[PDB]
Design a protein around this ligand. Structure first.
Ligand SMILES: [Zn+2]
Lengths: 107, 240, 99, 182, 175, 49, 111, 59, 50, 49
């Protein structure tokens, strides 16, 4: 229902925009609109092998978004990449225009 | 390892994709609560309260049929209501995945000739009731012609040089008309004096000589060197 | 932006009329009512925004780079097709000149 | 009618219960669907006049190419049909065989003129409006859809005053002056 | 309280599915390039080669007095298995009683023979399909159109009667 | 002349991963997943005739 | 106007035509009509063809042919003034006569 | 245009000459202005900017 | 010409245009036959040959 | 480059705004002017429409 789509609506956005989560992962080009019938499930790593794929009890979370937010290297990359996209996008638009005008005006 | 995925139905009916940051080929679990060969599982809570149903990761490096699915086959004939005759059910590795793709309303006849794999097949077919284990040589289908009737797809994971004769005998006995014939050909186990394309061309020619029209072949190369899946249908009258 | 004059845009046809909506000056009740969540929810909002703009700027970089690729492939492809057509229109005249 | 099998479709190929050869591909139906023509016989009443124009155009092109009778009557017929609006260009005389057409006479009808003048959103809306008696050409109210509007007579296609449609377009732009009733 | 713009209902040739031209009421497929191939090398073929013959290759062999298996052997310096498809054989039989010599030289126990499964006897279509399916075949031909088809599809060596012996082109290990 | 063919063969066998799918050597460790995506619409298999 | 009556060759369907315009094809023994069409010119006669699924009506001048639900299939440019229509069911022929002194046989299957 | 000339006599000497900005906008000098001395009126291909320099290429 | 009335004029002009266009135009494109059915074109040919 | 020297197809560097005339920032050159002019022309074209 829409009541559950309004709870998993963020990690579906993360899976849609997989390609810009890690700068080294580089998926194959699909579109992936939200499928009509899906189900959100949790991986059971069993009690046979330890320590390799094991995410412990102290760091298991409830979405993909909390894991990506708990990752501190991804936070470094997202903040840095967002600041450089920001200062590229505000490169010559309006603060530049009015500081050029104030440069003309000051003398 | 404790992460969360989204399950999504594949193009093929009965099999699914779990999307995360690496996406997994996944089937529903017919016997929930245990793994068969140590694969990982996914437990969804589907909505009396909701019930925890679960799913099993199909490993393409331990299954020729999963290597074929995720290399991209236009039509598998293993479908969610069908009957599959698995030849060379070497353990319960791929037979479990074929079994729960086929579902509770369909039947998988798992034919194997060795006996310790047969013991593991019977102990797996306890918790998967839609598996009929048949411990017999597939080179003589008359020795088990009484136990199986009118299958819809044959899958052949035998690795013997008389493969095409085994496939033809089992198809002529138990396959129905315009049913599925999925073959996993291993070039080195057929013969190693010629190259892989020569032995695949000869095996496809043998299939159409035994009137199984090939629709499609796939090399399944990143998972197995010099393998192939040939998907055909049992035409029985008029390959033309 | 394109600033179309008011004397022109009041005298436009019905299909060509320009939907320009005025800003809101009154603190309306639905805006003063509506709740926003804080802390973990506002950092989730910040995270989703950063992820979506990184995805959109990566896609724009990729399609601009593909535009720069395919204009020069168009250039070399048109040169090779011009050389080919020159060779065809001289071989045809050779053929007919012999026959 | 039952999707004949192979032996039946081979054995009776010319059988067709809908499309016949005298139908001419249902083009009366086709252009009366395009331009929303009420009565069945307007296509053929126009087809007679197109056949008159093309019969005269044949019999007039069969004259020698330089005599002033042929040149005068070809130019005179070309001018008359352009002024009436059936022909869209009075340049070449092959229009008198090729471009003279029931669809051209049907594009000159009153609802099609209306729809091209943006006076109604579709030809069926224009039919409904001039049936409801909103449209006058000149001073006098025109009531039937089939009215053919020549080139000089399409400058006077307006709405009647005291029309609710005229009132709502004026009040949409709130230029409604209630002194002159709208 | 009638409706306005009333019309006579006729049939719509654009819409009505009862008539025949309106009886016309995704998964892609990009076939992977073969694992037998390097870029254009075809690294997988190895002697004993197997060579698909067609009818003008046989006719030019008899016109130039080259034996089939011995001409193949001293062209490639390898052991050859020549293959006559049933459509090439059908074409040689359809050539009439002028070509009896060519037909009963194609009837040779040293020349093995495949079994094509299609309708019609178009050998160029059959040879092109079964060679671009598998890439384990040499094509021996002298048709200009078939030579252009085969040398446009990659990794397929092409043999042809030229002069008084066979020549081979797209096989990069001939000496 | 030797280092040039060493570095245009490394380029060639990096391009070969693009056109085909190259058998890299099998499953390295635990099966992590497909790591690049799964397309349910594309079928990269050779159909007959 | 006065209603020309016509029954299908098994008695299941009735086809009435008013003189003014009112043509109705109906299942007279259930209460199911399947065509009621008001063709405002003076109709004269009608007949079924091989079924209740097609019927031919003789209108002001031209004979028209309508399908089961009453959409017009054909306007016959011959059959200039019919007053009498009759179908020949073993031969599939619509026979037409009227104010002209002409008798016209029209094959319904081929057209 | 402000200072390439020192006097209206100099501009009168150079009337009608083709100038251009550094943007390649071509132009022509038309008439010396009266009260500021070396200042003149030029006409260009389109609107030049305040951050430009005009150029009279002589030899 | 300037004295040739109808059917002679149409067929005369058509004959001249055919004879001019048969040099550079293609032989499969200059003389297009009118589409006549098989069983009546063959009867036309048989009666004309008779 | 068939008969051209690489010391001949060098890189001519572009000049900056004069420091006396520096409050009107960025002396604009022909690429900047064409970016200005075609913008003005497309906006005048849609205004005329
Ligand atoms: Zn063949």
């Amino acid at each position: 229902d829409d009541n559950m789509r309004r709870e998993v609506q963020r990690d579906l956005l993360l899976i849609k925009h997989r390609a810009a989560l890690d700068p080294k992962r580089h998926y194959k080009k699909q579109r992936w609109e939200v499928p009509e019938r899906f189900a959100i499930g949790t991986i059971i790593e069993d009690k046979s092998e330890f320590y390799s794929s094991r995410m412990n009890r102290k760091e298991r979370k409830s979405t993909i978004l909390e894991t990506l937010m708990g990752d501190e290297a991804s936070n470094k990359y997202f903040k840095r990449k967002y600041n450089e996209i920001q200062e590229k996008s505000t490169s010559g638009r309006k603060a530049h225009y009015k500081k050029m005008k104030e440069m003309r005006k000051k003398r | 390892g404790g992460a969360k995925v989204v399950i999504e139905p594949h193009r093929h009916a009965g099999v699914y994709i779990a999307r995360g940051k690496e996406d997994l080929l996944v089937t529903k679990n017919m016997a929930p609560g245990e793994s068969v060969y140590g694969e990982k599982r996914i437990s969804v809570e589907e909505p009396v309260p909701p019930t925890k149903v679960e799913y099993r990761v199909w490993n393409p490096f331990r299954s020729k049929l999963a290597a074929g699915i995720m290399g991209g086959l236009d039509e598998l004939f293993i479908a969610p209501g069908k009957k599959v005759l698995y030849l060379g059910a070497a353990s319960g590795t791929s037979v479990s995945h074929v079994s729960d793709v086929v579902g509770p309303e369909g039947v998988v006849y798992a034919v194997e000739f060795s006996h310790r794999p047969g013991r593991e097949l019977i102990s797996m077919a306890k918790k998967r009731p839609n598996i009929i284990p048949i411990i017999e040589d597939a080179r003589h289908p008359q020795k088990y012609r009484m136990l199986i009737g009118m299958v819809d797809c044959v899958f052949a994971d035998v690795a013997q040089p008389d493969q095409a004769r085994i496939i033809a005998l089992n198809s002529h006995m138990f396959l129905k008309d315009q049913g599925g014939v999925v073959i996993s050909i291993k070039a080195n186990c057929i013969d190693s004096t010629v190259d892989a394309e020569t032995v695949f061309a000869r095996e496809v020619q043998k299939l159409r000589e035994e009137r199984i029209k090939p629709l499609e072949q796939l090399t399944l190369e990143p998972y197995e060197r010099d393998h192939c899946i040939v998907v055909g249908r049992y035409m029985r009258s008029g390959l033309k | 932006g394109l600033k179309v004059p008011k004397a022109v845009q009041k005298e436009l046809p019905f299909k060509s009329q320009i939907h320009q909506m005025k800003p809101q000056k009154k603190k309306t009740y639905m805006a003063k009512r509506a709740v926003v969540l804080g802390g973990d929810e506002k950092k989730a909002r910040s995270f989703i925004q950063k992820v979506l703009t990184i995805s959109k700027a990566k896609d724009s970089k990729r399609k601009e780079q593909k535009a720069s690729q395919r204009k020069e492939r168009l250039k070399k492809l048109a040169k090779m097709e011009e050389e080919k057509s020159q060779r065809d229109k001289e071989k045809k005249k050779e053929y007919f000149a012999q026959n | 009618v039952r999707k004949l099998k192979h032996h039946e479709q081979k054995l009776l190929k010319k059988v067709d219960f809908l499309e016949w050869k005298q139908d001419q591909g249902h083009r009366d139906t086709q252009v009366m669907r395009t331009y929303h023509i009420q009565n069945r016989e307007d296509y053929h009443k126009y087809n007679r006049i197109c056949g008159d124009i093309r019969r005269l155009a044949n019999k007039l092109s069969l004259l020698p190419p330089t005599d002033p009778f042929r040149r005068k009557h070809e130019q005179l017929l070309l001018d008359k049909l352009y002024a009436m609006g059936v022909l869209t260009t009075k340049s070449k005389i092959s229009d008198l065989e090729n471009k003279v057409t029931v669809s051209a006479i049907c594009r000159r009808r009153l609802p099609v003129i209306m729809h091209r003048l943006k006076m109604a959103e579709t030809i069926q809306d224009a039919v409904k409006f001039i049936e409801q008696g909103h449209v006058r050409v000149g001073p006098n109210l025109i009531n039937d859809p089939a009215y053919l509007v020549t080139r000089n007579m399409e400058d006077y296609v307006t709405w009647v005053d005291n029309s609710k449609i005229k009132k709502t377009l004026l009040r949409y732009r709130n230029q409604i002056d209630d002194f002159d009733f709208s | 309280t009638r409706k306005f713009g009333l019309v006579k209902r006729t049939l719509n040739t654009k819409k009505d599915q009862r008539l025949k031209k309106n009886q016309e009421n995704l998964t892609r497929n990009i076939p992977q390039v073969s694992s037998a191939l390097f870029f254009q090398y075809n690294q997988a073929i190895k002697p004993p080669y197997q060579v698909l013959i067609d009818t003008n290759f046989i006719n030019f062999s008899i016109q130039k007095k080259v034996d089939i298996v011995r001409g193949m052997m001293d062209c490639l310096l390898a052991k050859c298995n020549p293959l006559i498809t049933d459509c090439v054989m059908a074409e040689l039989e359809k050539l009439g009683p002028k070509y009896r010599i060519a037909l009963k030289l194609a009837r040779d126990p040293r020349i093995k023979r495949l079994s094509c499964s299609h309708k019609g006897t178009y050998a160029d279509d059959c040879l092109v399909h079964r060679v671009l399916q598998h890439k384990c075949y040499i094509v021996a031909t002298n048709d200009a159109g078939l030579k252009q088809r085969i040398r446009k599809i990659p990794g397929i060596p092409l043999m042809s009667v030229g002069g008084h012996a066979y020549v081979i082109e797209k096989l990069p290990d001939v000496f | 002349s030797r280092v040039k063919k060493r570095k245009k063969y490394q380029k060639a066998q990096k391009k070969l991963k693009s056109v085909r799918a190259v058998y890299s050597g099998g499953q390295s460790g635990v099966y992590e997943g497909e790591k690049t995506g799964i397309k349910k619409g594309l079928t990269r298999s050779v159909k007959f005739k | 106007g006065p209603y020309h009556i016509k029954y299908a060759k098994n008695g299941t369907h009735l086809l009435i035509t008013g003189r003014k315009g009112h043509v109705a094809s109906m299942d007279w023994r259930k209460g199911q009509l399947r065509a009621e069409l008001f063709l405002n010119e003076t109709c004269h006669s009608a007949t079924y063809l091989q079924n209740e699924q097609y019927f031919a009506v003789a209108q002001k001048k031209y004979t028209f042919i309508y399908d089961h639900e009453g959409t017009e299939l054909h306007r016959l440019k011959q059959h200039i003034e019919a007053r009498h229509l009759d179908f020949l069911p073993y031969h599939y022929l619509l026979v037409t006569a009227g104010e002209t002194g002409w008798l016209k046989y029209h094959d319904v299957s081929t057209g | 245009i402000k200072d390439m000339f020192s006097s209206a006599m100099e501009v009168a000497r150079f009337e009608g000459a083709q100038i251009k900005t550094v943007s390649g906008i071509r132009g022509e000098i038309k008439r010396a202005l009266s009260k500021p001395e070396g200042h003149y009126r030029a006409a260009f291909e389109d609107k030049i900017l305040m951050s430009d320099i005009v150029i009279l290429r002589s030899w | 010409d300037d004295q040739v009335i109808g059917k002679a004029r149409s067929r005369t002009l058509e004959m001249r245009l055919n004879r001019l266009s048969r040099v550079n135009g293609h032989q499969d494109k200059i003389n297009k036959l009118e589409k006549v059915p098989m069983h009546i074109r063959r009867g036309m040919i048989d009666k004309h040959v008779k | 480059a068939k008969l051209v020297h690489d010391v001949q197809k060098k890189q001519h560097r572009e000049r900056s705004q004069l420091t006396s005339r520096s409050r009107y920032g960025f002396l604009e050159k022909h690429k900047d002017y064409v970016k200005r002019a075609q913008d003005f022309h497309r906006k005048q074209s849609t205004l005329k429409v």
